[PDB]
Amino acid sequence: DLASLAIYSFWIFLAGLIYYLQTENMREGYPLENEDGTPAANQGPFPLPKPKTFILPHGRGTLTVPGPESEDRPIALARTAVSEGFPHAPTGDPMKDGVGPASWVARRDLPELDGHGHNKIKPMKAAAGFHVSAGKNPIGLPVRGCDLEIAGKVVDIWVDIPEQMARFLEVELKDGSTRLLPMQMVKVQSNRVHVNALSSDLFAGIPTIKSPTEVTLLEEDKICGYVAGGLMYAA
Amino acid sequence: ALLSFERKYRVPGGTLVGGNLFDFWVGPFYVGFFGVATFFFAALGIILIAWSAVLQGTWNPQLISVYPPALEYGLGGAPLAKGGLWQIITICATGAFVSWALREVEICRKLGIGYHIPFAFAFAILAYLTLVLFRPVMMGAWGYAFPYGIWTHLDWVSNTGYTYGNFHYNPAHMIAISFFFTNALALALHGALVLSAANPEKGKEMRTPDHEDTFFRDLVGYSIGTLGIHRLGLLLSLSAVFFSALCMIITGTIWFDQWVDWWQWWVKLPWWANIPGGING
Amino acid sequence: EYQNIFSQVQVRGPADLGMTEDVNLANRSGVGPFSTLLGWFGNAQLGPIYLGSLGVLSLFSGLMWFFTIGIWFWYQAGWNPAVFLRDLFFFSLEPPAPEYGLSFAAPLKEGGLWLIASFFMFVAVWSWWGRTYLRAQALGMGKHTAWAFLSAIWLWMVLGFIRPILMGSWSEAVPYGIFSHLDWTNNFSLVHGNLFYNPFHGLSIAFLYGSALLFAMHGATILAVSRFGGERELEQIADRGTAAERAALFWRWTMGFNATMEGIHRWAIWMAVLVTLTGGIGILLSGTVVDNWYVWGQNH
Ligand code: BCL
Ligand code: BCL
Ligand code: BCL
Ligand SMILES: CC[C@H]1c2cc3[nH]c4c(c3C)C(=O)[C@H](C(=O)OC)c4c3nc(cc4[nH]c(cc(n2)[C@@H]1C)c(C(C)=O)c4C)[C@@H](C)[C@@H]3CCC(=O)OC/C=C(\C)CCC[C@@H](C)CCC[C@H](C)CCCC(C)C
Ligand SMILES: CC[C@H]1c2cc3[nH]c4c(c3C)C(=O)[C@H](C(=O)OC)c4c3nc(cc4[nH]c(cc(n2)[C@@H]1C)c(C(C)=O)c4C)[C@@H](C)[C@@H]3CCC(=O)OC/C=C(\C)CCC[C@@H](C)CCC[C@H](C)CCCC(C)C
Ligand SMILES: [Cl-]
Ligand SMILES: [Fe+2]
C-alpha cells in the first residue's frame, strides 16, 4: 500500500537524519576523553564526523573541525577520586585561575570584526553617533557590589556597533584604571548600577584589556568568565 | 567520559540540597539530590505502568493505557486497578518533572549560567498540571484528566474537543495556535539564517552577523537582531503553551457551550445585529 | 543581574545600511524611523528594504489576491460597511462546486473569483520564494532560507493545488475565509476517518510540539549564556568560547548528550521543516490513497 510504503520510508529517512545530525553535533568536544585526558574506549554508537573547513573573513585564516584539540591553557584543578564521576577541585584561587564557573576559553587574542572588518565592540567614546536612546543612562553612576560598597563609577558603555546594543559597562576604579562589566551581569537602577556577582573588592581582579579602545575575544572570555564565577566564588 | 573541554567545569558546588553528598556524575549525567529524586519517581512510575499493563494483559506499548478514575469518584482516591495507578503515576510524573527542573537549577548554578531553561520548562510542567490537576480539580473529578496511553490520549483530545463543538472556535486556542505556527516559522528562519551565514555559497568566506541582518532587512525591512531572535523564540513557544493552558483552564469551568457561540459578542451586537444581509442576516 | 528579556538601556547610533556584496543597490530603499518600542526587545532600526522586479511582482499579485477576496467580501456584505465589519470572519470565497471538476469555466460568482484569487496567490508566493533565494545569493549566503520556505510552500501547494487536481475538482481546495477554513479543516478530518490516525499527521505534531520544545530550549540556552556573548553565534562557531562550552555542558549533564553552536541550528531547521514536510505528505495521501485513516490504521 502507498501510504504504508511512505511511512515506512519516512521512518528510514528519519533514522538517517538523526544519525547525520548527531555526527554534525560532534564537531567540537569529541573524541570523548577519560578524566586524565586520554581518549575514552567508549565513544557512543555514532562515528566522529569527517572534517569541514570554514574560511574566516578578513584574513583571519581557516578553522577545520573536528581536529586535534587542546586547551592551550593550564587547568588548576586536581582529581577528587580514583574512579570517574567525581568533582575536580580547584587547587588555587578558582577565580584568578579561570576554573569552574570562572572558566574562560583560549579564544583568539584578536577582537571580533564586523562585516567591514572594523572592531565590532567599541566604547561610546570611540563610536560616532551612539547614545543612550532609552531607559536609565548608567554613565557616571556609582557601581555597587553584592557587599553593598562602591567599586567605581561607570565612565562609558562598550557597544556592539552592528547590533546597536550595550555589551559592557566600563567602570573606573579607585586607582583610576578601568574594567569591563558584562551588561547582562548588572542591574542598572535609578541611583546606582548593582553587580550582584562581585563584591566591590573583586572588581580589581577583573582581567584587564591591552588597549583602551578595543577588546579581544580572549579578554572578553576572561572577563565574562571571571564575573560569572563570582556568583559561586564571591557567595 | 568527558568532552575534550569539559573537565575544567566539573568543580564541586551549586547544589541546593545535600551539599556534596550527591555532587557527582554518572557518565555524562549530573546526579545531585534532584537527580536521585528523578530516579526514584521515574522508576516507581514506570514500575506502576508495568503493573497496570499486567492488569490489562498486554505488553504492547501501542496498547497499554492507564486510565484516570471513573468520573463518579470525583476527587477521591480510587482503587489501584480502577484509577489509583493513574493517580500514583500522576504524582510520580509531577515529582519527576519538578525534580528534573530543580536538577537543571543545580546544573545552572555549577556552570554559572542564567536560569532561563528550568524557568522555560516550568511552562511545560504548568500545562501538564493544567490538564491533570488544575482543570480536573476545578471541574470536580479526576476522570476529566487524560489517560496515559499512546493512542487513547488522542481519543481523549478528540472526545474533549468535540464536547465543545469545533474547538477551533475557542479564542485562546486560536491565539495558542498562532504562537505555535509563528514559533515553527521563526525556528525554520533562525536555523536557516545562521546556517546560511556559517555555510555560505561555495568559494566564499564565512558570512558575519551583518550579512544576517542585511539579508533579513532586504527580505522584510527589519532585523530583530541576534539577541532578539532568541528572546523571540523563547517568547513565542512560552506564549503558545501559556495560551494552551489558558484555553483549557477556561473550558468546562467558565465555558460549557459550543465554542462557536462565544463569537456572538460580535455577530449579535444589537445595532448591526439586525441589518439585513451578509452571512448572519 | 536581570533576565536579559528586555533591554535595560537602549543605545542608538548611525543606521547600518547593510552589507553590499553583489546586492544591486538601485533596488534598496532608504532607512525608516527608529522604534524605541521595538528597541526594548530587539533592534530599533527599521529598513532599508530591497524591492526588485520579483518583490514588486510579489507585492502586486498579493495585493490583487487581497482585493479579489476583498471585493468578494463587500459583495457578500451587500456593500454595507456595518455588515462588512459584523461578518468579516464569516465571509468566505469558496472554490467551484464539484460539478465544474477541474475546469476554469466556473462562473465568476460560483468559483471563478476563487480561481482568480488563487492565480494571484500562486504568483505572489512563488515570486516571494525566488526573492528569498535571490536575496541570499546577492549576499553570497547559503540557500537555506529558500529551502526551508519550500517546505511551507509544499503544504500550501498540497492543500490548494496538488491534492485538488489529483482528486478531480477544485472543490477539494481550501476556501478563503477566517472561519470557513477552520470549518474546512474539521470537515477534512471527519471525512477522512479522523486525522489523528494519519501517521504523517502525528509526525507533523511531534515536530510542531518539538519546534516549541527546541526553540524554548535554545532561546533559553542562549539567553542563559548571553553573559558570555553566547548570542554571537557565528564567532562562537568560528572560535568556540566558554558560552558554547557551558551551553553544551548544561545539556550534556541534563540529558546525556549535546549540540554544538552550529549543529543546534541543524536540529532547528530540520525540526521546523519536518512539520510541513510530513504534513504535506499526510494531506496528499488523504482521499487519493487512504479514505479512512482510522480504518487504514487497524488494518494495513
Ligand atoms: C478534535 C480535537 C479538537 C482539538 C481539541 C483540543 C484539546 C481538547 C486540547 C487541545 C490542545 C492544543 N491544541 Mg487543539 N484541537 C483541534 C485542532 C487543533 C489544531 C488544528 C490545526 O486544527 C491545532 C494547531 C491545535 C493545536 C493545539 C495546541 C494549542 C494545544 C496542544 C499543545 C499543548 O497544550 O502543549 C502543552 C505541553 C504539554 C502538556 C507537554 C508537557 C510534558 C512535560 C511536562 C513532560 C513530559 C516528559 C516525559 C513523559 C518524558 C519521557 C522520557 C523520554 C526520555 C522522552 N489544535 C480539534 C478541533 N486541542 C490542548 C491544550 O491546550 O492543553 C493545555 C488540549 O487540551
Ligand atoms: C499536548 C496536548 C495533549 C496531547 C496531544 C497530542 C497529539 C494530538 C498528538 C500527540 C502525540 C504524542 N504525544 Mg501527546 N498530548 C499531551 C500530553 C503528552 C504527554 C504528557 C506527559 O503531557 C506526553 C509524554 C506526550 C507524548 C506524546 C508522544 C507519544 C507523541 C509525540 C509527541 C512529541 O514528540 O512532542 C514533542 C517532544 C519531542 C519531539 C521530544 C520526545 C518526547 C517523546 C518521544 C516522549 C514519548 C513518551 C511516552 C512513550 C511515555 C514515556 C514513558 C517512559 C518510558 C517513562 N503527550 C496532551 C494531553 N499528543 C502525537 C502522536 O503521534 O501520538 C502517538 C499526536 O498526534
Ligand atoms: C478537527 C481538526 C482535525 C485536524 C485537521 C487537520 C488538517 C486537515 C490539517 C491539519 C494540519 C496540522 N495539524 Mg491538525 N487537526 C486536528 C488536531 C490537531 C492537534 C490537536 C488536536 O492537539 C494538533 C496539535 C494539530 C497539529 C497540526 C499541525 C502539526 C499541522 C499544521 C502544520 C502547519 O504548520 O500549518 C501551517 C502552515 C501552512 C498552512 C503553510 C503556509 C505556507 C505559505 C505558502 C502561506 C503563505 C501566506 C501568505 C500568502 C499570506 C499572508 C497573510 C495572511 C492573511 C495571514 N492538529 C483535528 C484532528 N490538521 C495540516 C497538516 O499538515 O496535516 C497533516 C492540515 O492540512
Ligand atoms: C513550554 C514550551 C515547550 C517545552 C519546553 C521544554 N520542555 C523541556 C524543557 C523545556 C525548556 C527542558 O528543559 C526539558 C528537557 O530536559 O529537554 C530535553 C524538557 C522536556 N520535555 C520533554 C518532553 C515533552 N515536552 C513537550 C512540550 C514542550 N516542552 C513545550 C511545547 C512535550 C509535548 C507532548 O509537547 C513532550 C512529550 C522531555 C524530553 C523533557 C522532560 C524530561 C523529564 O522530565 O524527565 C524525567 C522523567 C522521566 C525520564 C520519565 C518519568 C515519567 C514517569 C513518571 C511516567 C510517565 C507518565 C507520563 C505522564 C505518560 C504519558 C504517556 C503519553 C502516551 C501520554
Ligand atoms: C516550514 C514550516 C513553517 C514556515 C516556514 C517559512 N515560512 C516562510 C519562510 C519559511 C522558511 C520564508 O522564508 C518566508 C518569509 O519571507 O519569512 C519572513 C515565509 C512566509 N511565510 C508566511 C506566512 C505563513 N507561514 C506560515 C507557516 C510556516 N512557515 C510553517 C509553520 C503560515 C501559517 C498559516 O502557519 C503563514 C500565514 C509569510 C509571512 C512569508 C511568505 C510571504 C509571501 O509569500 O508573500 C506573498 C504575498 C504578499 C507579498 C502579499 C502582500 C500583503 C497582502 C496581505 C496584501 C494586503 C495589503 C493591504 C493594503 C494591507 C495589509 C493588511 C492585511 C494583512 C490585513
Ligand atoms: Cl525583489
Ligand atoms: Fe541560535
Side-chain angles (χ1 to χ4, degrees):
Chain A
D1 161 72
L2 195 255
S4 283
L5 173 70
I7 190 72
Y8 180 73
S9 299
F10 191 87
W11 281 100
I12 302 330
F13 161 84
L14 197 54
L17 179 64
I18 284 159
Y19 183 98
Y20 162 73
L21 292 167
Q22 182 61 21
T23 66
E24 282 304 304
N25 283 281
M26 298 173 46
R27 289 187 182 279
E28 312 264 4
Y30 287 73
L32 305 188
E33 299 178 359
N34 300 308
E35 307 185 2
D36 70 11
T38 66
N42 191 24
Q43 297 284 336
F46 303 94
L48 234 220
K50 289 54 169 59
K52 83 182 280 186
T53 293
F54 294 94
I55 299 168
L56 318 187
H58 315 307
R60 290 279 181 85
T62 72
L63 184 241
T64 309
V65 287
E69 275 207 68
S70 178
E71 320 284 87
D72 26 297
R73 40 164 317 209
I75 299 297
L77 290 172
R79 192 164 190 153
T80 260
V82 207
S83 50
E84 307 222 307
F86 293 98
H88 299 234
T91 51
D93 173 333
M95 283 198 286
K96 287 176 155 279
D97 293 345
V99 297
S103 293
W104 50 269
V105 176
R107 310 184 80 200
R108 89 177 62 57
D109 197 9
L110 297 159
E112 188 172 345
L113 278 7
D114 69 12
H116 303 284
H118 294 198
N119 292 340
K120 168 178 180 76
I121 295 145
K122 283 179 212 261
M124 248 149 55
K125 111 202 61 143
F130 279 92
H131 66 263
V132 172
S133 58
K136 187 61 211 289
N137 186 335
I139 309 201
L141 276 179
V143 188
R144 176 179 99 168
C146 70
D147 56 346
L148 304 174
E149 322 272 355
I150 272 71
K153 64 164 324 197
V154 177
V155 290
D156 218 352
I157 304 163
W158 286 55
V159 295
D160 193 323
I161 285 166
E163 292 261 331
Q164 302 214 338
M165 77 154 258
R167 295 201 155 270
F168 301 98
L169 308 176
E170 168 168 19
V171 172
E172 195 197 31
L173 300 184
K174 284 315 82 86
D175 69 329
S177 68
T178 55
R179 297 300 186 294
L180 314 184
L181 272 292
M183 269 304 309
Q184 33 283 314
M185 295 300 277
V186 313
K187 188 97 220 296
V188 177
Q189 293 159 309
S190 315
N191 41 334
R192 94 276 286 200
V193 175
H194 183 70
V195 188
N196 176 238
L198 268 8
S199 63
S200 48
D201 55 334
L202 291 181
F203 285 67
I206 304 167
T208 51
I209 50 168
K210 280 112 219 86
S211 316
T213 48
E214 87 175 19
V215 66
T216 73
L217 292 178
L218 181 72
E219 296 163 350
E220 288 191 67
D221 246 46
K222 299 196 178 172
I223 293 163
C224 293
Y226 182 95
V227 171
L231 291 169
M232 178 171 297
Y233 299 124
Chain B
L2 257 38
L3 305 173
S4 76
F5 51 76
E6 166 171 4
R7 184 209 158 214
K8 66 191 184 297
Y9 300 96
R10 317 253 288 194
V11 291
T15 60
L16 296 172
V17 157
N20 77 340
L21 233 161
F22 308 107
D23 200 8
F24 60 81
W25 288 262
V26 166
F29 301 101
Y30 182 68
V31 180
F33 167 84
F34 298 107
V36 340
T38 306
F39 184 79
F40 164 80
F41 289 120
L44 175 61
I46 287 167
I47 280 156
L48 301 175
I49 294 175
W51 193 225
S52 178
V54 165
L55 290 191
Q56 202 186 320
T58 185
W59 272 83
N60 181 349
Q62 300 292 286
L63 280 289
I64 296 152
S65 189
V66 189
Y67 283 92
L71 289 173
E72 290 80 354
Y73 283 96
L75 301 167
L80 291 180
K82 274 135 196 198
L85 252 8
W86 185 93
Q87 303 176 129
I88 299 163
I89 294 157
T90 297
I91 294 170
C92 292
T94 311
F97 299 162
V98 172
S99 279
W100 197 260
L102 271 353
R103 175 182 175 259
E104 285 183 349
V105 185
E106 298 192 323
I107 292 160
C108 297
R109 307 173 103 238
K110 178 183 294 299
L111 282 173
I113 67 167
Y115 301 121
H116 305 72
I117 305 163
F119 164 92
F121 175 43
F123 279 68
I125 291 178
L126 267 348
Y128 163 80
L129 251 22
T130 285
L131 293 183
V132 123
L133 174 63
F134 309 144
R135 197 174 92 111
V137 153
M138 275 168 82
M139 292 176 79
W142 300 111
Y144 286 127
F146 64 99
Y148 300 157
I150 290 162
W151 299 102
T152 59
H153 90 297
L154 303 208
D155 306 342
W156 176 94
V157 180
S158 217
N159 303 330
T160 308
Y162 278 126
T163 299
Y164 303 89
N166 189 357
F167 224 75
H168 291 152
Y169 286 92
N170 174 343
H173 187 260
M174 292 184 173
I175 300 154
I177 289 176
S178 305
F179 282 115
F180 278 112
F181 286 172
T182 305
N183 186 76
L185 157 58
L187 186 60
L189 264 5
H190 177 60
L193 190 63
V194 173
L195 258 8
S196 76
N199 310 275
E201 264 176 16
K202 291 176 175 193
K204 295 272 166 52
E205 311 159 316
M206 195 168 189
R207 288 8 225 166
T208 70
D210 307 351
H211 295 262
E212 296 172 270
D213 283 321
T214 307
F215 167 82
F216 238 77
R217 251 112 72 164
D218 282 348
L219 190 53
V220 116
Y222 177 68
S223 172
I224 197 160
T226 63
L227 186 46
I229 187 66
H230 299 98
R231 313 209 270 214
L232 178 61
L234 186 61
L235 184 260
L236 301 173
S237 52
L238 267 31
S239 305
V241 163
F242 172 68
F243 284 99
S244 305
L246 179 62
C247 93
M248 289 306 276
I249 204 67
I250 65 172
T251 288
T253 76
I254 77 170
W255 189 269
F256 310 88
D257 297 52
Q258 281 202 253
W259 268 117
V260 61
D261 305 330
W262 189 90
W263 292 95
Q264 310 306 58
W265 92 265
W266 200 254
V267 176
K268 281 322 161 57
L269 247 28
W271 37 101
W272 67 36
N274 270 121
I275 309 188
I279 309 297
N280 323 295
Chain C
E1 91 255 4
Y2 72 140
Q3 290 294 80
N4 211 9
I5 297 274
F6 296 100
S7 294
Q8 281 178 294
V9 0
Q10 305 195 28
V11 154
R12 180 168 304 161
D16 205 298
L17 308 174
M19 297 305 298
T20 301
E21 299 298 348
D22 288 297
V23 174
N24 180 359
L25 273 19
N27 295 321
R28 211 117 96 171
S29 83
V31 164
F34 282 83
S35 170
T36 296
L37 168 84
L38 294 173
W40 293 116
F41 192 74
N43 267 90
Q45 173 187 320
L46 253 16
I49 194 172
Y50 185 91
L51 233 260
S53 280
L54 231 39
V56 157
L57 171 66
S58 190
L59 213 223
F60 173 77
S61 6
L63 298 168
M64 290 305 299
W65 170 68
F66 188 82
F67 278 88
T68 303
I69 295 168
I71 77 186
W72 179 253
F73 278 16
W74 280 109
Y75 166 81
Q76 278 193 316
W79 315 101
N80 173 7
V83 173
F84 184 81
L85 308 182
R86 175 183 90 191
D87 294 355
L88 191 54
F89 282 14
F90 292 86
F91 298 130
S92 187
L93 209 209
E94 296 282 322
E99 63 265 19
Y100 292 95
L102 286 178
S103 153
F104 301 93
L108 226 62
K109 292 196 214 102
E110 301 146 56
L113 222 46
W114 182 92
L115 292 152
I116 294 185
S118 287
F119 174 74
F120 283 137
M121 197 183 43
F122 185 103
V123 175
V125 172
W126 282 108
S127 304
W128 202 266
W129 182 85
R131 167 179 172 96
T132 68
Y133 185 100
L134 294 175
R135 302 348 311 149
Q137 183 173 46
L139 289 155
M141 299 177 84
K143 307 301 179 305
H144 302 78
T145 304
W147 178 88
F149 192 16
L150 265 176
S151 187
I153 289 168
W154 159 251
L155 205 213
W156 163 71
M157 279 292 277
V158 166
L159 285 162
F161 302 91
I162 300 161
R163 186 180 173 277
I165 290 170
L166 289 184
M167 285 295 34
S169 55
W170 295 121
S171 61
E172 297 284 337
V174 183
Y176 299 116
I178 302 307
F179 291 173
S180 65
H181 100 283
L182 304 185
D183 291 329
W184 181 98
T185 308
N186 178 55
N187 292 327
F188 191 98
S189 181
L190 256 6
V191 301
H192 296 93
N194 191 178
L195 220 58
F196 285 135
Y197 286 79
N198 183 342
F200 289 95
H201 183 264
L203 282 169
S204 191
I205 283 171
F207 298 121
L208 188 63
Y209 293 170
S211 295
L213 172 66
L214 194 52
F215 221 164
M217 275 168 70
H218 180 60
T221 299
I222 291 304
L223 306 186
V225 300
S226 59
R227 75 191 53 183
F228 319 102
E231 83 271 24
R232 291 146 61 187
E233 302 175 296
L234 294 180
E235 264 267 5
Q236 292 274 338
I237 291 171
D239 187 11
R240 197 187 75 235
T242 192
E245 296 194 352
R246 296 179 195 229
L249 295 169
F250 174 92
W251 292 107
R252 186 176 216 255
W253 295 351
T254 298
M255 70 182 179
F257 70 110
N258 59 263
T260 66
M261 200 50 97
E262 179 185 12
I264 194 59
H265 305 88
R266 297 187 190 272
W267 283 109
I269 202 176
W270 281 107
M271 186 70 78
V273 150
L274 294 166
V275 168
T276 45
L277 180 58
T278 57
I281 295 172
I283 295 314
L284 186 62
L285 293 169
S286 296
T288 60
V289 179
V290 177
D291 285 301
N292 192 300
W293 284 106
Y294 184 96
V295 172
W296 174 95
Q298 313 307 312
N299 303 117
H300 218 25

